[PDB]
Amino acid sequence: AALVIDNGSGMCKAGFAGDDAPRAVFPSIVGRPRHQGIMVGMGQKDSYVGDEAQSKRGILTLRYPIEHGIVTNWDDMEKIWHHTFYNELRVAPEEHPVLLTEAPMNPKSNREKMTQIMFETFNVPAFYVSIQAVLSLYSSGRTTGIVLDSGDGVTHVVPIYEGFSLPHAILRIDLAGRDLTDYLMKILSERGYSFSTTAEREIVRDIKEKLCYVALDFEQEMQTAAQSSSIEKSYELPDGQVITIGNERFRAPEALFHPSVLGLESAGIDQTTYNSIMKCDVDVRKELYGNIVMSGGTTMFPGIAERMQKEITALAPSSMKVKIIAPPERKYSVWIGGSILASLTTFQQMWISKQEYDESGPSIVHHKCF
Amino acid sequence: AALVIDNGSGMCKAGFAGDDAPRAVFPSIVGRPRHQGIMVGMGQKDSYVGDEAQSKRGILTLRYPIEHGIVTNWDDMEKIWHHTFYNELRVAPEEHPVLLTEAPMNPKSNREKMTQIMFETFNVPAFYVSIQAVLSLYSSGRTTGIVLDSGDGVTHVVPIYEGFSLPHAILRIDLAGRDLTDYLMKILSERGYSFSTTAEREIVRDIKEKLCYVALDFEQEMQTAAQSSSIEKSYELPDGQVITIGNERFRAPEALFHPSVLGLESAGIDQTTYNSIMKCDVDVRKELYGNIVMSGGTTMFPGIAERMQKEITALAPSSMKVKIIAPPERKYSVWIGGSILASLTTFQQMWISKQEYDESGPSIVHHKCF
Amino acid sequence: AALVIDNGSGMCKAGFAGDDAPRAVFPSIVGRPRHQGIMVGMGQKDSYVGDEAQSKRGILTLRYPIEHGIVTNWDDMEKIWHHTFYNELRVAPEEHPVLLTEAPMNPKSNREKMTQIMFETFNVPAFYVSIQAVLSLYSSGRTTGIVLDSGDGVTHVVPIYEGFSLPHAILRIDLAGRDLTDYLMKILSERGYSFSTTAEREIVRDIKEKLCYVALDFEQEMQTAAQSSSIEKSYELPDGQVITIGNERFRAPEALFHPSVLGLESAGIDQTTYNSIMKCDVDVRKELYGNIVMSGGTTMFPGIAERMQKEITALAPSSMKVKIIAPPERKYSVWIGGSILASLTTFQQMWISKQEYDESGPSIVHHKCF
Amino acid sequence: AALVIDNGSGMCKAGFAGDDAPRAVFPSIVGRPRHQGIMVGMGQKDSYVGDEAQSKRGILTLRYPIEHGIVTNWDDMEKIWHHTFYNELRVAPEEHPVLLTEAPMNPKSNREKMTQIMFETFNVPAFYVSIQAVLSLYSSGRTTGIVLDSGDGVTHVVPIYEGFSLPHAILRIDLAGRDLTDYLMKILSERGYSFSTTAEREIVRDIKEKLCYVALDFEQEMQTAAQSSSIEKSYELPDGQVITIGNERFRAPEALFHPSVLGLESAGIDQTTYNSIMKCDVDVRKELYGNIVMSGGTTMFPGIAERMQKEITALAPSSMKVKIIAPPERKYSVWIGGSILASLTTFQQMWISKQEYDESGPSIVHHKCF
Amino acid sequence: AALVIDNGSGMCKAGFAGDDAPRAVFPSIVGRPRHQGIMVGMGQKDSYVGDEAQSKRGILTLRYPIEHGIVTNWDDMEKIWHHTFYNELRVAPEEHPVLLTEAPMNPKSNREKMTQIMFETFNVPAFYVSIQAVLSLYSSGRTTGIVLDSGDGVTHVVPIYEGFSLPHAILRIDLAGRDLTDYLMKILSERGYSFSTTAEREIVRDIKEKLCYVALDFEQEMQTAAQSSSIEKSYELPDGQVITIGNERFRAPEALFHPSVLGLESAGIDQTTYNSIMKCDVDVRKELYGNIVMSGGTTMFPGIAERMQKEITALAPSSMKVKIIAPPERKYSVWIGGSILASLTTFQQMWISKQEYDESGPSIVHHKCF
Ligand SMILES: Nc1ncnc2c1ncn2[C@@H]1O[C@H](COP(=O)(O)OP(=O)(O)O)[C@@H](O)[C@H]1O
Ligand SMILES: Nc1ncnc2c1ncn2[C@@H]1O[C@H](COP(=O)(O)OP(=O)(O)O)[C@@H](O)[C@H]1O
Ligand SMILES: Nc1ncnc2c1ncn2[C@@H]1O[C@H](COP(=O)(O)OP(=O)(O)O)[C@@H](O)[C@H]1O
Ligand SMILES: Nc1ncnc2c1ncn2[C@@H]1O[C@H](COP(=O)(O)OP(=O)(O)O)[C@@H](O)[C@H]1O
Ligand SMILES: Nc1ncnc2c1ncn2[C@@H]1O[C@H](COP(=O)(O)OP(=O)(O)O)[C@@H](O)[C@H]1O
Ligand SMILES: [Mg+2]
Ligand SMILES: [Mg+2]
Ligand SMILES: [Mg+2]
Ligand SMILES: [Mg+2]
Ligand SMILES: [Mg+2]
């Protein structure tokens, strides 16, 4: 048996290898109370974590300890993994090897410290790290294809061909679900709803996750939303006030396709996907315009696959096939991929041993892990 | 064992912790005789106190030493506490720790001097102070909720969530039972009954406490009382004259809901409750429109909970639940709360020691007490 | 000629373009009488406005019609502008184009309705709106710099570089002079002075505006004010009672730097200034840690510029220059900026014409105005 | 039975003697993967070979192990023959004698090592080597004639008369299909198509093999291609981009006739054919200007036989017959010749025995083989 | 008089013939503003160019219009030449003949369009184009030698002997200063510094240009940098943050010698230099292993000449002299060469006349120019 952990930028996911879904899924938040606890005997916790910090969030400040795939507060990341093992999953980490997951292009000391914690704090017997996107080929059941991952923290494009990683053609893009949440909060001020707080940041996250959709023609839908209320769905806040959302319902996720809206130098996930395909080779692109795998929760918007089709077919060569492979499992495809990978018998020889970590410190990972 | 004292703005309440009701309940009045004592050998007392000063009030002037939760004559407050311990409760204060109670937002030197007296005059071995409203959550058996206290002296609204005190959302309001007594005396002049004296102020207090009720539609009941005597109950004074009370029977307590009648800048206990809920957060209001706890003797009017329902449901968001939690114990809910709090074993480490008061003077309270 | 109006959250300012100061300066208050006018022949006005409502305030309720830069009662805002043109400035609005001013990030329907009134009610011939902070660069005579505005209603940080607005790096912060007034009123209860009324809210505003100052070391000055009366200045109320102000003299404006005191999620104007600089780019920050322009009446506290220096230099990179550009004109720097902008000949082509407002309704502003 | 192997400089060909075509035909390439194989369980092969290395070429580097008829990496040549016997042809080499083929004028240690491998590695029971060109007389069914072979690696002219080899009149010429591929890649840069990679070298090979043709008047067709698009056919790359090919469509194969274009000292296959005929004798040329046999894949261009006619008739004596014997089988004429030769019963006494190789080492070949 | 223009892939250089250095040197960038220009009267330019776009780069997007020696946006190239003549050099192009410069092997329509612009847009009276590398022999004062040019865009190796161009032995290689900048940015992510923007791409260019050096033993210096901080110099960004650079200080320019690091099929400038020498002839190599001229800004790394010595002496024949002729002028050696060439009186008959361009269009260049 082995444990698979998405270590998600947004939702953490964890479970046993060989399962079809993670068992623990919870937001990767640590909540700190921001007020004096006047009532004796409530035993107020000094730091809530996961969905506890959701339920109490009104009295809390919520912080993600992982920003853009970089762990920004390790002591909180420790609290999150501790909660995962003991409270949320109820498993002994000393008994089971752990497959962690990381974004690509990720600062090397992050992968180092990650294993320093996982061995010296949790005493995991054997361990591995793998790239979020790469696992999506396993959950797709494939050996070729270009993966759009788009977590809360990072969008990264990873072309793979015949199990070779084409590492020079990875594009990493900082548009991600968290930044779409923030941009929605920025434009949702246009109707005069104020949501500046982190407790309200979470509400804007729910509004995005439920009511938003990707425009299939941004200018036409801007025109029709200026002409008609047809699009103007309405949401009910945790205080029971109703709000109505105009063209913001799609102007927000359109940021994925014109990042100049966020002022970013980058380019849309469409154009950067195309550009990664252009970058990889002439030989393989025949097999990468088809078989565009797509992954992670930000790729969950309605209409996103259709927009990707339209854009890539507008960028790819004339009479080149395009196929945006978008399962319904996108939100878990990374974890499912890790579950498959850890299941494979032909992988059980690859785990980094605790004994090897005793032979050499965390730097061992840069030798053993790819 | 410990002693719990409401130190009420109106009725004092005192008793032992772990009891279900206070044992000493008496009006917080000191009476001074206002005439020459011509009869030798009666041993006329230079100052009556409590219900002694009730029974003799015709020859006395009655003064409350505590006004709007501020102790205005400490030497009389000393007489009241002395009477409590020795005459009314018959307990040694040197043997028992005392939980006093205070209104919130209360001038800091009041809490200082309160403890300076309680240690240096009464030599109490250990001591604490707590907020009147907060105790009502203990007597409600709760950890969330917004408390309307309305003593004789102060109305104060205190939202609490998960034992955090949301201190920025406390609203303190100077409409209170004493000022309703005075306003009733003002309008009861309209029938030509004169009650200007303090001895008659007490009679107006009894008239209010027995015959008045909160209108559920002030304009409609004004109309029907103009149309019909149906409401016109009658009271019999301590001299046996009968009086009849017209629409004054509800026009007086309606002051709680339109303080412009008293010319106050403030706003009704309904609208200020709603406004405190608006002030606290967006997250918690879901749990504060429900679970509106209500406390203190002025909240005892018939119809007040129904009016609160009507008003808050008229102010709170559409499809937001409202529940005015109004036990029958309202008149003692503060004291019962203190009895529970002092009972808790997990509180016995919090008492301010006499030894600590010897380490630092009364200012110690602002460190130890919250 | 043209008219420039600050439309201030607190003090309104208005005057002609090309002047060095506004001619009309008055508090943006409408006062309603709260009592029966028993004396015949006084001609009592149904609503006083501006400094009339100051002089009569004892019998009035005072309401600001503009809250946090949002016009909350347009009919009163109309009364304020009407008073400005006809009573206070004595100018015909039909004859002169008007430059209004708005806070940034401000609800879009506010800017719409603002122009709907300005054309259809006042028949202004041509019109414009501009961001309060942006004008401060004109009154500084600059084309780069980050502006702290802090009116009565809104603190907003606006970085500008080479005349490009870096709109993604605007931080809007709800700490402002009005909320410092309210917090001072909250803590000034600690000495037992009660000022709950709006008529007394104005007195607390004067106390703040005269006697308060920003602490340069909050903990040290708390210590020394606990040790010594050296800081304890005294104020004389409009009734001639004297009051003394302890550490409240600086504990109140310290709210600008630890908003957790107000329970706000936000962060101090120092840390949010630094964070806006971090947000804008890597290229320009060299020119924004220097040239921190500062604006609006809340930035008028003694010691505030020194504290900003200390904090930003504690946050900015080592060996990065910091310069808090704080003229004496701060209280008018917005209006002076508008006066310059309206003066420029190279701006006279930008006014929204009445003819254009006849071609398209108030929504025209979102096209013409930036 | 016997096995016949062309050991081609470009396409390998192998099959059984007495067949009319080779059964295994595949490019003589070994492909090495050039990237990290990140996917576990694909079993990535350390070296692909033949048409496997075609299909995967995008991730590979492709190397021919035989350059200009010289085996440049014997370990790869071993892999190619191993693939031929076991994977591609599925035959046991221990059971069948093998006729290998070599270019003429070829470094003697090549023929030595070739047999050292064929006996000691593959344990072939009996063996022979013969000259590529000479076999073409057998597949032509002739005993006189001059053979232009032009493989990928070597052009060599071999006059034969009455079965005597005229060995002093062999001309060996290093213009060959591979070098025409490279030159086409050089000039195809003139339109700005870049194909520098070996994976793209293969694409240029396909472009040459499909669209190019030999000009029948190079200057006139240069003129007409400058005048008109009539010649400008278009190709579609493996990525689906279209390209158009101008005069490059014939300027490339014209290198065979003006090698000064490649900067080579040599002379065209026309002039070197004529010069070999001049070199051989006066007696036989009557039978060699007629009966110019032509062989190998580079002789497959459209128009090449017509150009040979024009050139040789311009060089050969007046009133001398010229006949360029160009079957359609040119691409296999060598192998078919070997199939006939190995078929002949009057050849079965000529095989080098394994027993003879045990009597004397590989040097035995220079005695037995001619 | 005549004007000489390097038309550099990276830094443009221009000046008068007969000077010892170019007078205008500036980066060949056009900058477009990426934000709304809110300040009236700044006259914001729609496109900055050269070192203007450096100074303002924080608000710009920077694009090179020339990629790998191919002009990719002619309208921007026009802006660059216009800036050169009028703003940066302040010369009338109608009065002076212009020597432009091009990379070799360069798409023929580029040289065409280049002259179409130079005559029809700038009305230059007479004109020429020459190969970047070839000019380096003039600035070396030589008639033999093999030139490594390595601009920002192209590395190209050009052997020349006795003034004959050996055109079949030119090797063109796409490793160049821009791609080393990009690779440094890729590995500099390993320390967690993010520089993905073009504005930050320029900063990575400065970091490379100042702190990087070519390793003389890549494995040994990797070992010693793993053992010791001795190499770990530090840079200070335009925001004043310090960074430290580990083995990246040499791992980046090592890409020139193992392009497999960039995944390129190509081979190091050492091995490709050797291979060009192998390709040219047997006669001349005696004079090309000596007299390896070296050119262009990418050849400016410390240690590069020593590494070239080590590698070429490891590849060249035993007891063959090797001499890497590396002046200090490398960064300008092309321009200086053009200055000499345009100076020569025996060149003044070679200019393409405007009259000849009127006789035949831009295709004239392919006749006149070599
Ligand atoms: N149905 C949905 N519509 C729009 N956005 C969604 C939806 N579901 C999830 N998301 C976005 O995806 C985020 C989760 O991303 P996740 O896959 O957990 O990142 P990671 O892969 O790093 O764990 C959510 O917080 C939300 O912002
Ligand atoms: N049944 C009743 N109806 C109306 N008013 C009442 C009733 N009972 C008590 N009150 C009011 O409540 C007052 C007592 O308030 P109390 O709770 O003693 O204040 P505190 O909480 O400060 O002790 C009485 O004096 C009277 O004015
Ligand atoms: N000298 C001062 N010291 C402290 N606070 C001041 C001083 N002068 C003005 N203020 C504060 O600034 C407020 C005015 O802000 P103002 O600039 O009018 O806002 P706006 O920019 O929206 O018009 C005053 O009401 C007061 O609260
Ligand atoms: N139809 C064609 N047109 C032009 N060139 C061709 C054609 N067919 C084959 N070739 C060239 O001939 C090459 C094969 O030569 P080949 O006969 O295999 O050499 P060898 O005789 O050494 O085996 C091909 O790779 C290609 O370059
Ligand atoms: N001292 C240096 N160290 C390392 N690299 C340098 C140095 N000087 C210049 N370069 C590189 O050379 C580039 C300039 O190349 P350049 O000669 O202008 O190309 P071109 O020959 O096409 O004009 C610089 O942008 C930089 O990348
Ligand atoms: Mg994930
Ligand atoms: Mg009480
Ligand atoms: Mg203002
Ligand atoms: Mg062959
Ligand atoms: Mg150059």
Curated annotation (Swiss-Prot), chains A, B, C, D, E:
It is found in: Cytoplasm, Cytoskeleton. SUPFAM superfamilies: Actin-like ATPase domain. Keywords: Acetylation, ATP-binding, Cytoplasm, Cytoskeleton, Hydrolase, Nucleotide-binding. It holds the Pfam family Actin. It catalyses: ATP + H2O = ADP + phosphate + H(+). Actins are highly conserved proteins that are involved in various types of cell motility and are ubiquitously expressed in all eukaryotic cells. This is Actin.
